[PDB]
Design a protein around this ligand. Structure first.
Ligand code: NAP
Ligand code: TLO
Ligand code: TLO
Ligand code: CL
Ligand code: NA
Length: 314
């Protein structure tokens, strides 16, 4: 019996990534889609099936919904995940889970008391390319790791470029460098006209001095890459956070007098993340690692926001 999924918010990202994944995944059935405008819900249900619902509370009342996907703007995550969980529904929440660590702890506490899965959806984590890269690094392809860089920048209740984009390179730094990353410094550029973070750069370090330089932004040409500098080489890759489902990653390595490129298989990370969430809900095995990684993520995001030098232009 597929888990029955309801969507709250007819988000662009839902239309483009999550909802086609739900639709194709045998283990999940889209049973309800809510919007602030019934017309918008109905356009989504005409596309992906389920019952179109006006307003979010009505969807949370349905007995034919086991789990809810929340692709709302970040600042609105906490209210709605809290309500979904109190309505007894497991929750897949688009990254970032929420806005700060104390809020994320309280959301996980509400979940825990009810035996429900709360999962922060970083679709990139479900692409096998990162493990294949980490296996190459562990095999010593570029020697010891010295430093890491990652960047996600795109051309121009919104979350700002830190919450909405910066979280990606920060989460990859956690994925590769481990659980002891500490803030060192950062800059956030804030546009006065709208009062909104439009870009930033942050420096983190592990306690051994392995650094991460993370760039993010929405006033930029498109970049989406990461890079490792090693004692005997370097490794980089593009399209690291949002490779198409059919796209073959290419790992680039350079060392003294010799470079190589490896083409990896294509994978649908969006399908795989929806499958991971469904399988956990179905089995009741809610990996502890997911929640602990999300809490450490939330801490580093707060430490960046708090510690950054903030610069307002013009
Ligand atoms: N461009 C992207 O897709 C992108 C990039 C980076 C990160 N993210 C993340 O993905 C999530 C969704 O971001 P998004 O930028 O895709 O949001 P979006 O297109 O603005 O969609 C959010 C949906 O939320 C609902 N909503 C409720 N109150 C709203 C309000 N006051 N203003 C606007 N929408 C409101 C709307 O659904 P109804 O109108 O149907 O109620 C809207 O379609 C966030 O966690 C964000 O960090 C998205
Ligand atoms: C390829 C590409 C994209 N974009 C723009 C188009 C879009 O405005 C932006 C992001 O496109 P994308 O990396 O494709 O990822 P999703 O659409 O899955 O978005 C999310 C990203 C993060 C969290 C959730 C969803 O970059 C470009 O400007 N040039 C490009 O070559
Ligand atoms: C799915 C997932 C993982 N994690 C956390 C939990 C775990 O701490 C970490 C990775 O989990 P995994 O992708 O299964 O591990 P692999 O070895 O296949 O991939 C590596 C790739 C690179 C370097 C290490 C591992 O992310 C999450 O927080 N949420 C998720 O949805
Ligand atoms: Cl390339
Ligand atoms: Na600050």
């Amino acid at each position: 019996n597929p888990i029955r999924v309801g969507v709250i918010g007819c988000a662009d990202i839902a239309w483009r990534r999550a909802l086609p994944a739900l639709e194709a995944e045998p283990l999940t059935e889209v049973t309800a889609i809510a919007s602030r405008r019934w017309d918008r819900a109905k356009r989504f249900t005409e596309r992906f099936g389920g019952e179109p619902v006006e307003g979010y509370p009505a969807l949370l009342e349905r007995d034919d919904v086991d789990a809810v996907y929340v692709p709302l703007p970040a600042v609105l995550h906490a209210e709605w995940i809290d309500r979904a969980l109190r309505a007894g529904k497991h929750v897949l929440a688009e990254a970032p889970l929420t806005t700060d660590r104390p809020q994320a702890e309280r959301l996980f506490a509400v979940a825990r008391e009810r035996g429900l899965l709360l999962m922060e959806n970083f679709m990139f984590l479900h692409h096998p390319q990162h493990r294949q890269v980490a296996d190459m690094l562990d095999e010593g392809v570029i020697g010891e790791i010295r430093s890491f860089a990652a960047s996600f920048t795109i051309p121009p209740v919104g979350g700002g470029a830190l919450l909405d984009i910066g979280v990606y390179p920060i989460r990859a730094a956690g994925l590769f460098l481990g659980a002891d990353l500490e803030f060192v410094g950062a800059v956030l550029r804030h546009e006065r006209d709208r009062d909104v973070v439009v870009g930033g750069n942050a420096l983190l370090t592990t306690r051994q001095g392995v650094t991460a330089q993370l760039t993010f932004g929405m006033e930029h040409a498109y970049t989406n890459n990461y890079e490792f500098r090693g004692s005997t080489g370097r490794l980089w890759m593009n399209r690291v956070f949002t490779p198409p489902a059919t796209y073959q990653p290419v790992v680039h390595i350079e060392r003294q007098d010799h470079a190589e490129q490896f083409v990896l298989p294509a994978h649908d990370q969006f399908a795989k993340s929806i499958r991971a969430f469904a399988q956990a809900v179905l089995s009741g095995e809610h990996p502890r690692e997911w929640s602990e990684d999300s809490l450490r993520q939330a801490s580093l995001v707060d430490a960046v926001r708090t510690g950054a030098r903030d610069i307002y232009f013009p």
